[PDB]
Each structure stands twice: as structure tokens, then as C-alpha cells.
Amino acid sequence: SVSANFIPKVYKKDEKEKAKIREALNESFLFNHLNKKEFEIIVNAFFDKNVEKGVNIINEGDYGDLLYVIDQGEVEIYKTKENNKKEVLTVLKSKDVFGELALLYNSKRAATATALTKCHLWALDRESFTYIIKDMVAKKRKMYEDILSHVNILKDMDPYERCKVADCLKSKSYNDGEIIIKEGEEGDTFFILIDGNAVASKDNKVIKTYTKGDYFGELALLKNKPRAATIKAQNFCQVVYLDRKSFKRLLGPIEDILHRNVENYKKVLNELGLDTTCIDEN
Ligand SMILES: Nc1ncnc2c1ncn2[C@@H]1O[C@@H]2COP(=O)(O)O[C@H]2[C@H]1O
Numbered sequence: 001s002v003s004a005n006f007i008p009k010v011y012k013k014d015e016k017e018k019a020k021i022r023e024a025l026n027e028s029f030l031f032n033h034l035n036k037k038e039f040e041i042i043v044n045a046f047f048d049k050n051v052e053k054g055v056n057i058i059n060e061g062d063y064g065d066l067l068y069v070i071d072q073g074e075v076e077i078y079k080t081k082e083n084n085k086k087e088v089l090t091v092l093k094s095k096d097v098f099g100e101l102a103l104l105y106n107s108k109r110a111a112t113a114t115a116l117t118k119c120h121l122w123a124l125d126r127e128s129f130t131y132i133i134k135d136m137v138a139k140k141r142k143m144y145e146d147i148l149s150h151v152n153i154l155k156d157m158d159p160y161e162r163c164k165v166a167d168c169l170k171s172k173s174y175n176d177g178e179i180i181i182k183e184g185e186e187g188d189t190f191f192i193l194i195d196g197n198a199v200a201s202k203d204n205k206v207i208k209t210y211t212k213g214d215y216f217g218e219l220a221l222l223k224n225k226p227r228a229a230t231i232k233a234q235n236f237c238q239v240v241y242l243d244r245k246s247f248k249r250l251l252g253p254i255e256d257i258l259h260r261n262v263e264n265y266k267k268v269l270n271e272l273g274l275d276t277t278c279i280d281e282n
């Protein structure tokens with residue numbers, strides 16, 4: 001049932017279902033950037049769609065009118081290449097979002113989405129998405145998409161996965177002399193330097209210099225220890241950063257690289273006669 005410029009629609013939902021939608025959208029950085037008021041407009045504008053196992057919810061190539069959030073069930077996303085060689089991009093489950101690209105970029109569906117089980121989906125129409133959400137998401141991606149493709153650790157990531165990093169980024173600048181990370185302090189944040197110069201030290205010995213595209217502050221996140229080193233700006237630095245939960249959601253596909261760079265730290269620390277127990281885990 002529908003309850004009564006752009007005027008949002010309100011589709012009748014129990015508070016129990018509304019709480020599930022809020023959970024899913026607060027997890028998604030496509031959405032959790034909205035104020036309380038606008039957020040609730042979006043929650044109310046979702047309607048539902050039930051789909052049998054085996055149904056292609058979306059076909060690679062179609063025009064795009066809705067995005068979807070999974071309530072229950074599992075959805076495989078794939079591309080069909082070559083000699084009908086199915087190429088599975090990913091498997092999506094409860095709370096996952098898909099179908100945003102057509103609404104974001106007015107483009108043919110980039111892949112096929114197939115229900116692997118029966119699915120209950122919540123659907124958001126193009127109109128609600130474009131009025132409420134599109135502009136700010138598109139501009140944040142425009143601001144960072146290119147920068148991120150030149151960050152060396154992110155270069156081995158799918159472009160689709162990388163645009164998601166843009167969605168959850170926060171921005172901050174530091175002045176000459178300002179301290180970004182202090183040795184011994186508790187921290188929960190992963191950093192990329194996007195402009196300027198900074199320097200890392202431990203027990204007042206210099207252990208690394210940083211320039212544009214470098215990252216730091218991952219060690220406290222990979223190890224659950226206090227910051228292992230002090231990092232200081234040397235000019236007008238601009239950084240972007242991720243919180244711990246975004247870091248472990250997004251930079252899973254590059255754990256292996258991060259851990260490898262961690263053992264170069266080890267060689268530096270052993271050379272300078274510094275503490276190497278900050279590398280091991282506790
Ligand atoms: N690697 C990927 N490339 C493109 N789309 C993807 C990928 N992984 C998941 N998807 C989702 O699959 C959807 C297919 O339709 P859309 O292109 O509108 O939006 C797409 C994304 O939500």
C-alpha cells in the first residue's frame with residue numbers, strides 16, 4: 001500500500017522490516033552519508049520484490065530502472081564471455097546492494113544477476129535514487145576515482161571494487177610539522193597520502209619517507225597494537241583515510257600485499273637496531 005517538485009513515495013512496511021533495511025543501508029556507503037531525514041525517505045521509498053531460485057533478476061545488457069538490496073537469499077553476479085564461458089564476478093548475500101551502476105551512470109547492466117536461492121529483495125526506483133542520492137555519490141567518485149587508480153597497493157584491484165573505496169573515504173589535511181600518527185597511541189585508521197610529503201620515525205630514527213600515493217597506518221589494523229611509529233607531515237599534506245571496519249571490508253583482496261610490505265619494515269627495523277616485536281601479532 002502506498003501512503004500519501006519531487007514527492008517521495010512511502011510504501012507500507014512494519015517496523016521490523018524497516019529495521020532490517022536500516023541495517024543494510026547503514027552498512028552501505030552508497031547510503032549512510034545521508035542525514036536522518038533523507039535516510040528515512042529512502043527507507044520508506046523501498047518496495048519489495050520476490051524472486052524464485054534461477055530467476056535472472058538483472059540481465060547483462062538491459063536498461064536499468066531499479067537498484068536492489070538483498071533481504072534474504074543469494075545472488076550470483078556474472079559475465080558471459082568467449083564461448084558462453086560464464087565468469088562469476090561475485091556472490092552476494094543478505095544486505096548486499098546491486099544494480100546501482102545503471103542508476104549511477106545511465107548505462108547498460110554490466111552483468112547478469114541470478115537468484116541462487118529464492119530471494120526477497122528490496123527495490124529502489126531510479127527517480128528516488130537520482131533525486132536523493134546520485135549527485136553526491138557521483139561527485140565523490142569523480143573526486144577520487146583517478147587518484148585511487150594511481151595508488152600502488154590498489155592497482156591490483158577491480159575498478160568496480162576501487163570506486164567503492166571512494167565512497168567510504170574521509171578527507172583531511174595536515175600542516176608543516178603537524179603529527180599525523182604518534183608512536184604509542186591507539187589508532188583505528190588507515191591512510192593514503194594524496195598530496196605532499198611526510199616522514200616516519202621510531203625511537204627518533206628515520207625509517208621511511210612518503211610522497212603522493214603512499215599509504216600508512218595499516219599495521220595497527222593488521223596487528224591490533226598501538227601505532228608502531230610516528231608519522232609527521234613535512235609540508236602541506238592531504239590524506240584520505242578509512243576506518244577499521246571499512247579497511248577490513250575493502251582491503252581483503254590485498255591482505256597478501258600488505259603483509260608482504262610488512263616484512264620490509266622488518267628488514268629496516270633489524271638494520272637500525274629497532275623493536276621488531278611490533279611486527280608480530282598479539
Ligand atoms: N565486478 C563487477 N563489475 C560490474 N558490476 C558488478 C561487479 N560486481 C558486482 N556487480 C554488480 O552487478 C550489477 C549488474 O548491473 P549494474 O551494472 O547496474 O550494477 C552491477 C553491480 O551492482
Ligand SMILES: Nc1ncnc2c1ncn2[C@@H]1O[C@@H]2COP(=O)(O)O[C@H]2[C@H]1O
Nearest residue numbers: 208216217218219220227228229265268
Ligand atoms: N619499518 C617500519 N616498521 C613499522 N611500521 C612502519 C615502518 N615504516 C613505516 N611504518 C608505518 O608507520 C605506521 C605507524 O602506525 P601503524 O603502526 O598503524 O602502521 C605503521 C606503518 O604504516
